[PDB]
Scaffold this active site. Structure first.
Site, PDB file in Angstrom:
ATOM      1  CG  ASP A  43      24.008  -8.661  -3.082  1.00  0.00           C
ATOM      2  OD1 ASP A  43      24.813  -9.573  -2.407  1.00  0.00           O
ATOM      3  OD2 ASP A  43      23.137  -8.613  -3.460  1.00  0.00           O
ATOM      4  CG  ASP A  45      22.944 -14.401  -4.253  1.00  0.00           C
ATOM      5  OD1 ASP A  45      22.918 -14.824  -5.360  1.00  0.00           O
ATOM      6  OD2 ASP A  45      24.020 -14.447  -3.796  1.00  0.00           O
ATOM      7  CB  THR A 111      28.807 -12.510  -4.657  1.00  0.00           C
ATOM      8  OG1 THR A 111      28.031 -13.390  -4.173  1.00  0.00           O
ATOM      9  CG2 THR A 111      29.919 -13.188  -4.837  1.00  0.00           C
ATOM     10  N   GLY A 112      28.829 -12.559  -1.164  1.00  0.00           N
ATOM     11  CA  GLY A 112      29.522 -12.829  -0.353  1.00  0.00           C
ATOM     12  C   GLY A 112      29.301 -14.507  -0.558  1.00  0.00           C
ATOM     13  CE  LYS A 151      28.177  -8.358  -0.017  1.00  0.00           C
ATOM     14  NZ  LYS A 151      27.699  -8.816  -1.484  1.00  0.00           N
ATOM     15  CG  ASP A 166      18.774  -8.538  -1.470  1.00  0.00           C
ATOM     16  OD1 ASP A 166      20.214  -8.675  -1.698  1.00  0.00           O
ATOM     17  OD2 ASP A 166      18.809  -9.333  -0.763  1.00  0.00           O
TER      18      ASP A 166
HETATM   19  N1  LIG Z   1      17.817 -18.543   1.167  1.00  0.00           N
HETATM   20  C1  LIG Z   1      18.887 -18.019  -0.265  1.00  0.00           C
HETATM   21  N2  LIG Z   1      17.811 -17.653  -1.046  1.00  0.00           N
HETATM   22  C2  LIG Z   1      19.053 -17.393  -2.099  1.00  0.00           C
HETATM   23  N3  LIG Z   1      20.355 -16.223  -1.995  1.00  0.00           N
HETATM   24  C3  LIG Z   1      20.675 -16.688  -0.512  1.00  0.00           C
HETATM   25  C4  LIG Z   1      19.934 -17.369   0.813  1.00  0.00           C
HETATM   26  N4  LIG Z   1      20.939 -17.300   1.721  1.00  0.00           N
HETATM   27  C5  LIG Z   1      21.806 -16.790   1.586  1.00  0.00           C
HETATM   28  N5  LIG Z   1      21.841 -16.697   0.363  1.00  0.00           N
HETATM   29  C6  LIG Z   1      22.879 -15.605  -0.251  1.00  0.00           C
HETATM   30  O1  LIG Z   1      22.961 -14.353   0.236  1.00  0.00           O
HETATM   31  C7  LIG Z   1      25.132 -14.410   0.910  1.00  0.00           C
HETATM   32  C8  LIG Z   1      24.906 -13.526   1.259  1.00  0.00           C
HETATM   33  O2  LIG Z   1      26.192 -14.007   1.833  1.00  0.00           O
HETATM   34  C9  LIG Z   1      25.015 -15.564   0.706  1.00  0.00           C
HETATM   35  O3  LIG Z   1      26.672 -16.037   0.693  1.00  0.00           O
HETATM   36  C10 LIG Z   1      24.291 -16.739  -0.062  1.00  0.00           C
HETATM   37  O4  LIG Z   1      24.713 -16.402  -1.008  1.00  0.00           O
HETATM   38 MG   LIG Z   2      21.540 -10.093  -1.658  1.00  0.00          MG
END
Ligand SMILES: Nc1ncnc2c1ncn2[C@H]1O[C@@H](CO)[C@H](O)[C@@H]1O
Ligand SMILES: [Mg+2]
Ligand SMILES: Nc1ncnc2c1ncn2[C@H]1O[C@@H](CO)[C@H](O)[C@@H]1O
Ligand SMILES: [Au+3]
Ligand SMILES: [Au+3]
Ligand SMILES: [Au+]
Ligand SMILES: [Au+]
Ligand SMILES: [Mg+2]
Ligand SMILES: [Mg+2]
Ligand SMILES: [Mg+2]
Lengths: 211, 211, 211, 211
Positions: A43, A45, A111-112, A151, A166
């Site tokens: 992943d 983020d 990534t989503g 995914k 995460d």
């Molecule tokens: N508030 C946030 N802060 C950081 N990353 C985020 C937040 N909300 C969603 N994400 C990321 O996590 C991904 C999981 O789908 C989302 O598409 C988005 O890119």
């Molecule tokens: Mg993440």
């Protein structure tokens, strides 16, 4: 509640541990000894990048009261094409990726985030984590829109054997395909709240992976 | 640096506490009950704003392989005039600033950042933290000069009675003027390292103040 | 509840601190530097002796289902005349008493245990903690029965300036007389349950004082 | 040995976790679901009984200034024939023993204590922990011989598939026979020191198992 002025504590609470299968990068590496080069996924983020600065910026700019920015193409064009210069790379990711590179593993990022016509995320990642082009694969933008695959479907397609993430859906995606899902802690200063219950599925969780 | 694969632990280590004066925002408010409006001060970086995104970006842009960006006026112009759009407000600061607004206190921000011709930092703070015009005071850019605590004379000048900060110099500035210095935890994903030893002067430290 | 099979955790909970004024023996000693010899007091049970073995034994022997043994003179005659040979001295008490002896302080023990015609507790304490007879005073059995005086009245009578204890009533007794009440952690394997909320009154609590 | 008066701390240290396979009793029961009755074993000291009271007493009585009491047959006669009346049953053991009784498992206790002509330990255990005649087996006094693990051959002989214990030798005995070795925390007020590094062989460790 009450939430007392002076709550106090006791030594049962001080020593209390949740029943989690914590692992270290060193132990993961040991578990892989003698296993041939394989595909592994991450992943992005809160797993390898603390990217909340760009998401904070996006919220504040595009939808100050809601989470509508998360479905705003204008935001994504900005987020995927340079706002990750303000994202802070995670030391846990540096360690994981260094050791998977040292193994000769294929490294995928799934990534989503919404896809955009161009993206500089693949480059930001390869550069910050020193990922040889040989190990590196362009970021996969996964999901349910027309022209996308989920995914899970991606993990199956690229034969990914380990997936680091995460979020609950990172771990369930790995589990749905028989891959080893490994949890990274979301930093408490992430703007993606509430924080997940790391370990909620009995999965391995990496120690000290919040940074 | 190598460490044991399975170091294990024990319940003395599990329960072990450093002898820190931990406080809550409620306890601080309670300790001040009855006291009329006063001047109070806040450090900015890692105290009210997780600003590592802008500093990380600055380093990459201006001095990839050193700290020279911190003495570059072009860096300060960017950092003080927009890069805080990527800075993440801390919850502890929202609670603290709310409490001092409730008290009718005059709120100052005393930063080690270098003064620039213009700054949008005061705006970002008064906006993010919903700070009324009457409690708000323009940010004091005290700059940084190693060997010298540049904050002390400002706390003296503004009659600041309580100073909040993450760094040893924040606490020592308060001590210099007989103000109450109160420590905020620097987040572990801050790029400003090493982390300070919060509590190292016997000062109060705010619980859970990393986010 | 639910209390899940796999609860998981998050890094906000992992780093979470209760807002407690933790102190070390070293800091207490530092706070006393230059203060003339004074009287100080200690609770006995779970403060200086882990005495639950004798209390367990007493319960199991005299009142297996209730706490009636606690008002059984036969139990007290046994508890106060040798069953403390099975009590385990607390390292925190060894440190406190060594440093108060080194100061030249008068050392008192004030217990809620029921008085008995004879007692060997004073001797057990002086012997295990190496308390000179000069510093040592016979154990005070405090309470509300005819011919007794309460903990508070005793602290006033002996001019005790600091009182160490694990129970709420230890701290309130010190507070009622203007003495400095200092909390010791009750060990989680004590049979005196539930464990107190150490710090519930804003008092100092000694780090790692469960052993 | 001296240390800083105010060492302070930071949030990396506050949140830091050792990479331990922590488990709960519920998770262990769940991992065994479907498995028919089997033999399982328990170490005694600091695993099911906090027995330090008797050992502390023994040392004071038989060898104040050494460990010779541990090789004294008069000490073992006392320790095995009544001094466990002062031993405090552990809650984790109540939960574990209850769970194995629910399973219909055969329960054995394999102790490093020296065999004596008579023993009332089996009685104390079957009573304290409400162990039915059918699940209960007389305590195996395997004795202690440095250089040799005296438990391994007993686990082999009794076909024990799961062994619970606080010491490294408990876990190594299980490993020797291919049984599942599961660690219980030794309480920090145990007089048997130093505390073992629970988790040091990568074995599962039971959360909150110090009491
Ligand atoms: N508030 C946030 N802060 C950081 N990353 C985020 C937040 N909300 C969603 N994400 C990321 O996590 C991904 C999981 O789908 C989302 O598409 C988005 O890119
Ligand atoms: Mg993440
Ligand atoms: N279950 C217990 N285990 C150990 N000490 C106890 C227990 N119950 C009470 N105490 C002691 O603490 C004292 C406080 O009044 C009581 O008089 C008693 O001596
Ligand atoms: Au498992
Ligand atoms: Au206070
Ligand atoms: Au700086
Ligand atoms: Au032993
Ligand atoms: Mg700062
Ligand atoms: Mg007590
Ligand atoms: Mg043992």
């Amino acid at each position: 509640s009450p939430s007392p002025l002076n709550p106090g504590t006791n030594v049962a609470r001080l020593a209390e541990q949740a029943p989690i299968h914590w692992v270290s990068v060193a132990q993961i590496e040991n578990s892989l000894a003698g296993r041939p080069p394989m595909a592994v996924g991450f992943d992005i983020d809160d797993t390898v990048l603390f990217s909340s600065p760009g998401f904070w910026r996006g919220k504040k700019t595009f939808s100050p009261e809601s989470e509508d920015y998360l479905k705003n193409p204008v935001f994504w064009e900005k987020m995927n094409n340079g706002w990750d210069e303000f994202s802070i790379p995670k030391e846990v990711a540096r360690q994981l990726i260094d050791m998977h590179v040292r193994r000769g593993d294929a490294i995928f990022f799934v990534t989503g985030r919404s896809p955009t016509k161009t993206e500089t995320v693949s480059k930001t990642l390869a550069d910050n984590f020193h990922i040889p082009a040989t190990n590196m694969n362009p970021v996969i933008f996964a999901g349910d829109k027309p022209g996308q695959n989920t995914k899970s479907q991606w993990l199956q397609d690229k034969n990914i054997r380990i997936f680091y993430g995460d979020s609950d859906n990172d771990i369930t995606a790995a589990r749905d395909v028989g891959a080893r899902g490994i949890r990274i802690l979301r930093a408490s200063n992430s703007t993606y709240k509430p924080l997940p219950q790391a370990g909620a599925f009995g999965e391995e969780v990496i120690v000290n992976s919040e940074y």
